């Protein structure tokens, strides 16, 4: 016998004590070793309701990642409100590692294994585990990176699809590589991401076909963001400790979906920025210029964050723009199939 409850989780990882890389240092202190023998138990004839948007595990992961960045990526200059803090800001070794979330004694985690589960409602194929799978705390906007993939069809996730203030998460079932480089020396802040146009456009066509299912076969259109901070109007992420901002206008190109001059490599222009708005929500930070040499991150695009235009009530089409900003949604994109219960 069990019931929905919230409690204090602990983390587990394969972090290395000798490693200088910052996620490793954090997890060596904060976490235990990965379950040497993970076993999940299928709950026969059991149906359980889930709600990925009201899942306190997400809150706890957000706290960890904020704590990790706070002690490893402190800005040389922090501007919060009007007060200026100056502190050291050495370059670091930075590359996210998988972190598992695990329940304390007297609690367990239920896991939804329905292959087209959208994050809310009833789940027919349920199992219990002691820990989630290993989740990398990748912070990004617009595109979800290095995450897990939908196993069957592309899945659309939203707390309320008709609520245009709610972010939509698209969960891909096939990843598309994005290859971002700041070349070794020259503008030291000029960088770019390369994506295979053919692959990306095929996926994006399937995404529109899935979206059509949720909006009455209406015409689906992508457009670039209409406003906001650069962290959200651009694909924002951290590669090797450096903050990237990439322009995704070419990535959401309707002309290609459905013409053929699109196949080929898509080169998005990016810039490294020393002065950023902190996704933590805590204000403006200023870092030192980028390290020398070839700065390169190849990532899997496994998800997309979207905002749908209002004012389309009695129109023939629906318009989507890349979104993000609320990093808790990043963790939701991976934690969606889990919930904590207390064993009575």
């Amino acid at each position: 016998v069990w019931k929905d409850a919230d409690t204090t989780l602990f983390c587990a990882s394969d972090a290395k004590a000798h490693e200088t890389e910052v996620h490793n240092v954090w997890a060596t202190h904060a976490c235990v070793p990965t379950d040497p023998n993970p076993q999940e138990i299928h709950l026969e004839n059991v149906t359980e309701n889930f709600n990925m948007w009201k899942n306190n595990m997400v809150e706890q992961m957000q706290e960890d990642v904020i704590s990790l960045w706070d002690q490893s990526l402190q800005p040389c200059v922090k501007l919060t409100g009007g007060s200026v803090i100056k502190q050291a800001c050495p370059k670091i070794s930075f590359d996210p590692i998988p972190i598992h979330y695990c329940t304390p004694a007297g609690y367990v985690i239920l896991k939804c294994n329905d292959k087209n589960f959208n994050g809310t409602g009833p789940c027919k194929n349920v199992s219990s585990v002691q820990c989630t799978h290993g989740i990398k705390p990748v912070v990004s906007t617009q595109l979800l990176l290095n995450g897990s993939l939908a196993e069957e069809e592309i899945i659309i996730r939203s707390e309320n699809l008709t609520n245009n203030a709610k972010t939509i998460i698209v969960h891909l079932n096939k990843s598309v590589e994005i290859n971002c480089t700041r070349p070794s020396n020259g503008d030291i802040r000029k960088a770019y991401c390369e994506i295979n146009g053919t692959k990306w456009n095929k996926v994006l066509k399937q995404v529109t076909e899935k979206l059509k299912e949720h909006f009455n076969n209406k015409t689906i259109i992508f457009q670039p963001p209409s406003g906001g901070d650069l962290e959200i109007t651009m694909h924002h992420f951290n590669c090797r400790g450096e903050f990237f901002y990439c322009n995704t206008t070419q990535l959401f190109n309707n002309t290609c979906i459905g013409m053929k001059g699109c196949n080929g490599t898509i080169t998005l222009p990016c810039k490294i920025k020393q002065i950023i708005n902190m996704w933590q929500g805590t204000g403006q930070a200023m870092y030192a210029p980028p390290i020398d040499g070839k700065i390169n991150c190849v990532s899997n695009i496994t998800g997309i964050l979207l905002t749908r235009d209002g004012g389309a009530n009695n129109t023939s089409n629906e318009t989507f723009r890349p979104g993000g900003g609320n990093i808790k949604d990043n963790w939701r994109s991976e934690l969606y199939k889990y919930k904590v219960v207390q064993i009575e």
Partner: antibody
Amino acid sequence: QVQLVQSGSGVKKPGASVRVSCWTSEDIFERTELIHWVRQAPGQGLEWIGWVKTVTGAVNFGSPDFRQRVSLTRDRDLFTAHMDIRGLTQGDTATYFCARQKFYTGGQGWYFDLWGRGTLIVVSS
Amino acid sequence: EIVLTQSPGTLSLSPGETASLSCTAASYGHMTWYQKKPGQPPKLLIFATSKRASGIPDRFSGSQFGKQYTLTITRMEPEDFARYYCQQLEFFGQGTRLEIRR
């Protein structure tokens, strides 16, 4: 039911631009996730114009016309939200309200618990 | 089609009586309700369909029958005579004008 503060009403010639501003206390702005703008034309109903998220400056609008002509921004340091309207038309004469939506509304839709007193904009030559 | 239909357009009642207003929505969705007096901004009364806002007296209630969302004001006071609007997401109802019957 404290009120949000708004700039004073005024008259604008057709085709001009205007900025309407909305500010409040640090505590309130801190507990505001979105600032919405809603207008009411004389003797008519309420019409949603758009929103801006206070934390990220993200926006959305009630129509292409609004997306085209209205800019929604905020200044987190001064706990203020701005609505810039350009190409003012006679159809834009209305009282414009700013209104607040809290964090964590979950699945219970849109409800604005604090409102500004409204700014009358009269478009006339 | 129309997303919200509010009724009645007008309602005439005596103080102490109970008013029943409805907003019939095309789709299910938590309903909000405002009071609106001339020269003053909307005042939140009910949200999440049936939850009362802070400081709102318990004579104001909200509920629903299927897609028919309803606002009830029992034992009306003078101060309660005004216009009333429902809001579901970005859409507002046409409004109900509640005036004193004599």
